[PDB]
XYZ file of N, CA and C in Angstrom:
264
model
N -8.220 -15.910 46.607
C -9.158 -16.999 46.827
C -10.557 -16.459 47.126
N -11.591 -17.113 46.588
C -12.954 -16.546 46.531
C -13.543 -16.229 47.904
N -13.009 -16.808 48.978
C -13.465 -16.612 50.351
C -12.937 -15.287 50.926
N -11.690 -14.944 50.603
C -11.101 -13.636 50.865
C -11.711 -12.549 49.956
N -12.014 -12.893 48.698
C -12.690 -11.993 47.764
C -14.137 -11.687 48.197
N -14.957 -12.698 48.519
C -16.346 -12.502 48.978
C -16.391 -11.802 50.333
N -15.489 -12.136 51.267
C -15.256 -11.350 52.497
C -15.094 -9.865 52.177
N -14.106 -9.524 51.355
C -13.820 -8.131 50.951
C -15.004 -7.450 50.236
N -15.618 -8.125 49.255
C -16.766 -7.631 48.477
C -17.994 -7.397 49.354
N -18.303 -8.302 50.281
C -19.422 -8.156 51.217
C -19.140 -7.074 52.273
N -17.876 -6.874 52.658
C -17.430 -5.737 53.475
C -17.480 -4.388 52.733
N -17.398 -4.377 51.399
C -17.740 -3.228 50.555
C -19.268 -3.092 50.317
N -20.041 -4.183 50.366
C -21.455 -4.207 49.966
C -22.473 -3.967 51.095
N -22.364 -4.683 52.225
C -23.409 -4.755 53.256
C -22.918 -4.543 54.691
N -21.667 -4.095 54.830
C -21.067 -3.639 56.091
C -21.271 -4.627 57.265
N -20.733 -5.866 57.168
C -20.870 -6.919 58.177
C -20.470 -6.534 59.602
N -21.038 -7.258 60.562
C -20.423 -7.524 61.857
C -19.438 -8.696 61.773
N -19.862 -9.815 61.168
C -19.266 -11.140 61.466
C -19.491 -12.118 60.307
N -18.577 -13.071 60.070
C -18.736 -14.130 59.055
C -18.159 -15.492 59.496
N -18.739 -16.599 59.016
C -18.169 -17.946 59.063
C -18.524 -18.714 57.786
N -17.515 -19.078 57.018
C -17.662 -19.478 55.609
C -16.671 -20.586 55.186
N -16.902 -21.254 54.045
C -16.138 -22.436 53.586
C -16.328 -22.698 52.085
N -15.278 -23.132 51.380
C -15.394 -23.695 50.038
C -15.563 -25.231 50.040
N -16.532 -25.731 49.270
C -16.803 -27.171 49.097
C -16.143 -27.715 47.814
N -15.799 -26.826 46.875
C -15.239 -27.090 45.543
C -14.006 -27.992 45.432
N -13.278 -28.243 46.525
C -12.270 -29.316 46.586
C -12.878 -30.731 46.483
N -14.214 -30.819 46.449
C -15.025 -31.987 46.108
C -15.204 -32.267 44.610
N -14.718 -31.399 43.715
C -15.019 -31.446 42.278
C -13.767 -31.483 41.384
N -13.921 -32.058 40.185
C -12.883 -32.195 39.156
C -12.639 -30.882 38.370
N -12.544 -29.761 39.090
C -12.444 -28.394 38.549
C -10.985 -27.987 38.289
N -10.703 -27.134 37.286
C -9.335 -26.804 36.871
C -8.510 -26.071 37.952
N -7.178 -25.963 37.791
C -6.328 -25.167 38.677
C -6.760 -23.697 38.742
N -6.697 -23.104 39.938
C -7.195 -21.749 40.211
C -8.725 -21.635 40.306
N -9.450 -22.759 40.247
C -10.910 -22.824 40.340
C -11.401 -23.144 41.757
N -12.361 -22.352 42.228
C -13.047 -22.454 43.526
C -14.553 -22.198 43.298
N -15.217 -23.134 42.613
C -16.534 -22.937 41.971
C -17.716 -22.917 42.940
N -17.505 -23.438 44.148
C -18.546 -24.052 44.979
C -18.380 -23.664 46.460
N -19.393 -23.034 47.074
C -19.172 -22.266 48.311
C -20.357 -22.186 49.310
N -20.019 -21.934 50.580
C -20.932 -21.735 51.715
C -20.525 -20.511 52.529
N -21.510 -19.726 52.958
C -21.337 -18.530 53.800
C -22.319 -18.517 54.964
N -21.848 -18.032 56.103
C -22.685 -17.446 57.143
C -22.198 -16.053 57.491
N -23.153 -15.172 57.779
C -22.934 -13.756 57.907
C -23.833 -13.193 59.009
N -23.284 -12.286 59.811
C -24.030 -11.351 60.657
C -23.816 -9.933 60.145
N -24.916 -9.195 59.962
C -24.878 -7.749 59.684
C -26.104 -7.022 60.244
N -25.908 -5.776 60.679
C -26.983 -4.830 61.029
C -27.886 -4.468 59.836
N -27.487 -4.817 58.603
C -28.276 -4.625 57.372
C -29.372 -5.677 57.136
N -29.478 -6.684 58.007
C -30.375 -7.828 57.875
C -31.561 -7.799 58.855
N -31.685 -6.778 59.714
C -32.907 -6.473 60.446
C -33.920 -5.565 59.717
N -35.201 -5.679 60.087
C -36.347 -5.036 59.418
C -37.104 -5.959 58.450
N -36.844 -7.266 58.538
C -37.036 -8.270 57.488
C -37.439 -9.628 58.100
N -38.234 -10.428 57.380
C -38.301 -11.892 57.581
C -36.988 -12.565 57.123
N -36.595 -13.731 57.680
C -35.408 -14.468 57.235
C -35.483 -14.880 55.751
N -36.644 -15.371 55.299
C -36.890 -15.706 53.891
C -36.891 -14.447 53.008
N -37.529 -13.366 53.472
C -37.564 -12.068 52.785
C -36.145 -11.530 52.523
N -35.276 -11.505 53.549
C -33.884 -11.038 53.409
C -33.032 -11.957 52.547
N -33.172 -13.280 52.680
C -32.521 -14.262 51.808
C -32.882 -14.029 50.334
N -34.179 -14.007 49.992
C -34.671 -13.661 48.643
C -34.141 -12.303 48.166
N -33.970 -11.333 49.071
C -33.329 -10.049 48.760
C -31.837 -10.185 48.396
N -31.016 -10.967 49.116
C -29.599 -11.187 48.723
C -29.498 -11.992 47.420
N -30.395 -12.947 47.231
C -30.392 -13.900 46.121
C -30.770 -13.219 44.804
N -31.743 -12.302 44.836
C -32.132 -11.493 43.685
C -31.326 -10.198 43.507
N -30.991 -9.471 44.578
C -30.186 -8.255 44.450
C -28.730 -8.582 44.145
N -28.149 -9.524 44.895
C -26.691 -9.614 45.039
C -26.080 -10.852 44.397
N -26.807 -11.425 43.458
C -26.398 -12.643 42.760
C -24.961 -12.640 42.198
N -24.478 -11.525 41.641
C -23.092 -11.384 41.176
C -22.121 -10.984 42.297
N -22.600 -10.423 43.408
C -21.806 -9.913 44.493
C -21.459 -11.042 45.475
N -22.353 -12.028 45.626
C -22.106 -13.334 46.177
C -21.444 -14.293 45.166
N -22.040 -14.455 43.978
C -21.779 -15.557 43.044
C -21.040 -15.159 41.775
N -20.194 -14.146 41.892
C -19.424 -13.559 40.789
C -18.359 -14.514 40.247
N -17.439 -15.005 41.106
C -16.413 -15.990 40.763
C -16.776 -17.433 41.172
N -18.006 -17.635 41.655
C -18.528 -18.866 42.270
C -19.839 -19.236 41.591
N -19.784 -20.305 40.804
C -20.879 -20.802 39.974
C -21.984 -21.520 40.783
N -21.708 -21.914 42.039
C -22.725 -22.342 43.007
C -22.372 -21.959 44.454
N -23.299 -21.329 45.171
C -23.169 -21.056 46.597
C -24.467 -20.953 47.406
N -24.344 -21.170 48.723
C -25.448 -21.039 49.694
C -25.107 -20.136 50.904
N -26.074 -19.351 51.410
C -25.906 -18.447 52.567
C -26.741 -18.837 53.804
N -26.326 -18.359 54.981
C -27.205 -18.064 56.126
C -26.928 -16.647 56.666
N -27.959 -15.803 56.761
C -27.862 -14.389 57.144
C -28.526 -14.097 58.499
N -27.804 -13.403 59.386
C -28.129 -13.237 60.811
C -27.954 -11.787 61.307
N -28.512 -11.508 62.484
C -28.391 -10.240 63.222
C -27.527 -10.389 64.489
N -26.817 -9.322 64.905
C -25.856 -9.436 65.991
C -26.514 -9.788 67.322
N -27.670 -9.229 67.699
C -28.310 -9.614 68.963
C -28.673 -11.113 69.024
N -29.073 -11.733 67.905
C -29.296 -13.183 67.848
C -27.963 -13.938 68.017
N -26.909 -13.515 67.297
C -25.585 -14.160 67.352
C -24.902 -14.035 68.726
N -25.067 -12.884 69.389
C -24.489 -12.560 70.707
C -25.038 -13.496 71.779
N -26.327 -13.818 71.702
C -26.992 -14.674 72.681
C -26.889 -16.172 72.357
N -27.429 -16.635 71.220
C -27.656 -18.080 70.985
C -27.473 -18.556 69.521
N -27.355 -17.623 68.569
C -27.818 -17.714 67.162
C -29.350 -17.809 66.976
């Protein structure tokens, strides 16, 4: 399932601390074995040194197949552990 796959792929790609994620694709008339449509939240030490928009544009342009490989539509939120530890 694409949530276990994107978990594994992002753990190979950007070395996470933490994730909270969901598929929305049970909302659509999509074929059996299809999970087209997705949401992610992520914490990683790889997301500091950056503006929030700057890092988002970096995942969206760099990692388009690494996020959206088996998923024809998805959205992210990307975070740092010191922000997540305190308040988000």
